[PDB]
Symmetry: C3
């Protein structure tokens, strides 16, 4: 018994760095603006896990509206989403995350991202894949306006 999910997120650059991606603080000349900490990777992953569980999305569980989630970081949101998915009967298959960013270079921070996600999800590191790619100077990411992320997940019952 297996179930698929998909997530996608974008955050627009603003302010100063560091930016936070997959739980890791990365030195960069500007920050990521958000109601939240702007962790596009953990947000997209959270939506994919919630999607596979038919529990909706991050905004559904954690409205900006609701003061209870004020100041929560993305790993806290991920762990809470995961607790609710697990109470629904699911366990982790695997996840795959694709960060879309012209800069900064992601791959030196990626090992650490994988450990944080694997810790947060109670899974083996081998169940977690993160990668990055540019859009070769094209689009809002290529122009350096923001960063995006796509993620997929497989849950088991």
């Amino acid at each position: 018994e297996m179930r698929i999910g998909h997530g996608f997120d974008v955050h627009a650059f603003g302010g100063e760095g560091p930016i936070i991606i997959g739980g890791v603080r990365i030195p960069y000349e500007k920050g990521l603006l958000a109601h939240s900490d702007g962790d596009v990777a953990l947000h997209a992953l959270t939506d994919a896990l919630l999607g596979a569980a038919a529990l909706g999305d991050i905004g559904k569980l954690f409205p900006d509206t609701d003061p209870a989630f004020k100041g929560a970081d993305s790993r806290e949101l991920l762990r809470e989403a995961w607790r609710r998915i697990q109470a629904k009967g699911y366990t982790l298959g695997n996840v795959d995350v694709t960060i879309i960013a012209q800069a900064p270079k992601m791959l030196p921070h990626i090992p650490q991202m994988r450990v944080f996600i694997a810790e947060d999800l109670g899974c083996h590191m081998d169940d977690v894949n993160v990668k990055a790619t540019t859009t070769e100077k094209l689009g809002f990411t290529g122009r350096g306006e923001g960063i995006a992320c796509e993620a997929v997940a497989l849950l088991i019952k």
Copy 2:
């Protein structure tokens, strides 16, 4: 036992007057959606994910511009026919997940109804269908309000 994955992606540009139709739900908006079809970007991407999982190509291959049969059909009809053809290969539904990418309008209040309509079209339980939405934080064509995109993934079982 045998499960199969598919992915769908669709975009339409805003044009004319609202409402827009997303996941079979009429949503009031200042703009409509330009399409030869009803412009239902969610059902179109979902349809391609399902066809994708079944290796049946895509909506364009099933319903060519030049085939009169389905010219003028709404997207739920196309979804229901695509689905008929997928089941004729011996597939049933695992689950689906849809990700609407739109700066506006707000989708979340209409998602419950979209899910009802998809579940009835696919003959499945509500629990096998997820729909979500995200903005692009005012970035890109979606963020500027030029149109709406949608991705979908699907799992089928043989």
Copy 3:
């Protein structure tokens, strides 16, 4: 066990045609700029297969440091990735690729892409889906500045 992977790739138009998509040469006013042959569909597919197996991505597997695959075409890269993935004990479930291009027209060329991909992955044609879509003149693909590709893959252990 089944595992899921996701890939995404983009190359900008530049130079003269033809471009190569899914191993198939397609005439066009412009080429695709790239260090490699610029086959976005093969690169996205390769990344989806590597992500499923948690082997990272095409840049991790083939760094500029390694002379072995420098100047290698995208089918050679796909086949090497697939060798590394099979060595981890995986075989193919199925793949689905989505080319995102305003132009050129991809439809007539898709049948040979599928044959080439099934050859390279040692699978049946029925395990390979390839489709194309435009973005209706929106965004960087819509204005003919480049071509993007998404892909997903399911592996079995």
